[PDB]
Amino acid sequence: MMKRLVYISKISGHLSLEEIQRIGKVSIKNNQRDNITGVLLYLQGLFFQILEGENEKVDKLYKKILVDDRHTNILCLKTEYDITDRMFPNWAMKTINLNENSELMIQPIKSLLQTITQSHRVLEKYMPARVIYLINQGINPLTVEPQLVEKIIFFSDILAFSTLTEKLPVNEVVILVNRYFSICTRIISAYGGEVTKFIGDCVMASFTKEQGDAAIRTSLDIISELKQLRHHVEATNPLHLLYTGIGLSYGHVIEGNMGSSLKMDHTLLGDAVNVAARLEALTRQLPYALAFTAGVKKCCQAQWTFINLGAHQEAIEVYTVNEAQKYYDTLQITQLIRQTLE
Amino acid sequence: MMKRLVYISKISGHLSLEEIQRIGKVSIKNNQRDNITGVLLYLQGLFFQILEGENEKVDKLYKKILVDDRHTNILCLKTEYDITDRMFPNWAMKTINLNENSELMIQPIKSLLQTITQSHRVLEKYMPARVIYLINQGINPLTVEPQLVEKIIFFSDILAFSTLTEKLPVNEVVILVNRYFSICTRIISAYGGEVTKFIGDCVMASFTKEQGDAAIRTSLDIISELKQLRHHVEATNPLHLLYTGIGLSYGHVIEGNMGSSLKMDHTLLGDAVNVAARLEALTRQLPYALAFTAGVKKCCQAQWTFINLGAHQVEAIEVYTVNEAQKYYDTLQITQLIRQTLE
Numbered sequence A: 001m002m003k004r005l006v007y008i009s010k011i012s013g014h015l016s017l018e019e020i021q022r023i024g025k026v027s028i029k030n031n032q033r034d035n036i037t038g039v040l041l042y043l044q045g046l047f048f049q050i051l052e053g054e055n056e057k058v059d060k061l062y063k064k065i066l067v068d069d070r071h072t073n074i075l076c077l078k079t080e081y082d083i084t085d086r087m088f089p090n091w092a093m094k095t096i097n098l099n100e101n102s103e104l105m106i107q108p109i110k111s112l113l114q115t116i117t118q119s120h121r122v123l124e125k126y127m128p129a130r131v132i133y134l135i136n137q138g139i140n141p142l143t144v145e146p147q148l149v150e151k152i153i154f155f156s157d158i159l160a161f162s163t164l165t166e167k168l169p170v171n172e173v174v175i176l177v178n179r180y181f182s183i184c185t186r187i188i189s190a191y192g193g194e195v196t197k198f199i200g201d202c203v204m205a206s207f208t209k210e211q212g213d214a215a216i217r218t219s220l221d222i223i224s225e226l227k228q229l230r231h232h233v234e235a236t237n238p239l240h241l242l243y244t245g246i247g248l249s250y251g252h253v254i255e256g257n258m259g260s261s262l263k264m265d266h267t268l269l270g271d272a273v274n275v276a277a278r279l280e281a282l283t284r285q286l287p288y289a290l291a292f293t294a295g296v297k298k299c300c301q302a303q304w305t306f307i308n309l310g311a312h313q314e315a316i317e318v319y320t321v322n323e324a325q326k327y328y329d330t331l332q333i334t335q336l337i338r339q340t341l342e
Numbered sequence B: 001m002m003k004r005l006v007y008i009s010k011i012s013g014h015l016s017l018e019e020i021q022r023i024g025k026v027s028i029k030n031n032q033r034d035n036i037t038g039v040l041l042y043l044q045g046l047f048f049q050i051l052e053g054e055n056e057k058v059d060k061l062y063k064k065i066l067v068d069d070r071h072t073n074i075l076c077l078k079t080e081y082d083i084t085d086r087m088f089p090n091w092a093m094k095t096i097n098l099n100e101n102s103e104l105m106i107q108p109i110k111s112l113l114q115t116i117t118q119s120h121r122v123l124e125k126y127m128p129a130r131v132i133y134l135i136n137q138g139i140n141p142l143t144v145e146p147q148l149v150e151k152i153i154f155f156s157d158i159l160a161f162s163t164l165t166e167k168l169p170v171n172e173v174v175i176l177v178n179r180y181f182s183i184c185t186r187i188i189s190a191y192g193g194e195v196t197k198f199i200g201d202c203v204m205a206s207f208t209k210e211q212g213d214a215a216i217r218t219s220l221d222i223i224s225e226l227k228q229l230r231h232h233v234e235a236t237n238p239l240h241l242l243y244t245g246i247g248l249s250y251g252h253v254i255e256g257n258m259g260s261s262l263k264m265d266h267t268l269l270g271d272a273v274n275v276a277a278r279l280e281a282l283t284r285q286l287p288y289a290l291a292f293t294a295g296v297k298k299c300c301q302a303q304w305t306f307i308n309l310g311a312h313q314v315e316a317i318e319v320y321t322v323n324e325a326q327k328y329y330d331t332l333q334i335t336q337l338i339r340q341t342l343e
């Protein structure tokens, strides 16, 4: 049984022709050994490669290509299973430099390939992490049926954001929100979470039921990095006033494509979505920057010092960890933010 | 001063090769008359075209191509302004059938072009409508600066949706929410509004300050169509229990693309977003399915019977509605009925 995969990647730094040639050599010898065939194209700092052969031999090779130093931002676009015929049966690995092709009849298809691929890499950034995951696994996300899954829902936004938008210039708000989004997205993804969307100044993400401790560590790391950043910059920098509240929930959610032909989107339906956003807002009245449900506590194996914060509106038990304790008074900080921006 | 555009589109069904030849035939006569050059390519049901020439002459042609019924789902991928040299100065319009090219050395580039373009069209389905607009207008969404704009914010969601998710199978709630999203998105777009995103069962949209009456008409039309739907279906259909509440606000919001190279999104930054979401939730406690601020009321010029619902803490703000938004039902009675029907 043979499979065929196609991926694109970003060329790491500047690779000269001899190192690219070095890839072609070692590829030809190894692919001949593993009976693997394919084509490698590169154009304007992007790699294009098609691989075909036995499933084990191809998947063994792709794991090694993933950890290669010479390219980054790897996305597998298509995986064809149970293929009957090779597409390039006489090319162990044919390397083609599309940059050096100056033939006039090939310029249209070469120009289109560059334009659509560069546009493709832009659209990838706006996708939910779940959509990129399905494409990477060779699954068309448009034909996946929605499923009831057990998810930890993550919500985090900016403290006193109404005051920040009221007093700061728009360009200064954008710099602050982009930095907040960058910190949250990097940490969530580092712990295996999946960012769903940005809603105003709010970051929505999900974790699996096996990632309870990772969800808590994500929340504490975001709080820790914001605390570091606030004393990194000067008092005239709006980042000096950046705080966050975080809420976590756990429950059954329907994940999949929702909408119509006018607008379809990756959506999460469930009570846990509403609950996580409510606990996120509840942190404003709590001496803790993180609040989560009993279900999230049940998903944790680490020895957290869980703190019961009573029942809140049916009514749900609210928990936190001792590490999430605020070294400040929330009301005084909101006053300090407004006073600083006066 | 010349510009160059490139777009992709879906070939409309039943389009014969003979019809394509007359496209290229007519294109050659008009583009040479207008000093327009470019290439038209098609592969596996998709059109690819590059157009270059003087700004107004290229624009005039593209508006005519936009309304051509021989293709749909047109996306202008890239626009280059003030180009120095034409890319195809000798081709008024060269038509290339990539389906007929079987040369072995072109096959890799041809196979990759189809794979990336088909993958691209899948990603477009998940893109925010505002970003698709920016790309069509030749604007780089990753570098364009967000702007402070005056917007009416729209928020609506499903009444007792927790009970619906608790008591219905997965395929049934998906059908129900898809029908709700379809009704809302069609009506919002029909009145000129822009659906921002779906947040669970909640629909977020925006209107301009000149669309105050359109936002109220959108809200009443959604409520009206759900009322029609409930008596169109049988009692065993979950759509028989579909109700909505709607909140509207007005204020300054920062609109633009936010995030990092790892994750981007289109968002609206402002107090008005939170206020509209709070007023939407307030409709559960009100005898009206629509609630909005005084700012929305000031954006209206039609002869609505505005009703003051008093001050409400979301400092408290005045909450308003229109007499048409009155509920013919008791809200708590309906939520208990939804729970008891699904028992």
Ligand SMILES: Cc1cc2nc3c(=O)[nH]c(=O)nc-3n(C[C@H](O)[C@H](O)[C@H](O)COP(=O)(O)O)c2cc1C
Residues within 6 Å of the ligand: A023, A026, A027, A028, A030, A031, A040, A047, A049, A061, A064, A065, A066, A068, A070, A071, A093
């Ligand atoms: C874009 C790209 C494509 C590659 N394709 C192949 C390939 O098709 N076959 C192969 O053996 N190595 C390929 N490599 C190199 C492998 O990642 C790896 O470095 C090589 O197989 C060295 O094998 P070894 O370190 O296990 O001895 C590719 C590397 C890059 C950057």
Ligand SMILES: Cc1cc2nc3c(=O)[nH]c(=O)nc-3n(C[C@H](O)[C@H](O)[C@H](O)COP(=O)(O)O)c2cc1C
Residues within 6 Å of the ligand: B009, B023, B026, B027, B028, B030, B031, B040, B047, B049, B061, B064, B065, B066, B068, B070, B071, B093
């Ligand atoms: C994919 C596609 C590309 C087209 N490209 C051109 C073109 O480059 N130049 C042109 O004159 N017409 C082009 N047309 C046809 C025009 O849209 C239009 O049908 C034609 O110019 C008729 O002009 P008129 O009826 O307004 O006189 C294209 C049509 C399609 C479907």
Ligand SMILES: [Cl-]
Residues within 6 Å of the ligand: A303, A304, A305, A306, A321, A322, A323, A324
């Ligand atoms: Cl702890």
Ligand SMILES: [Cl-]
Residues within 6 Å of the ligand: B130, B134, B255, B256, B257
């Ligand atoms: Cl925008």
Ligand SMILES: [Cl-]
Residues within 6 Å of the ligand: B304, B305, B306, B322, B323, B324, B325
């Ligand atoms: Cl009225």
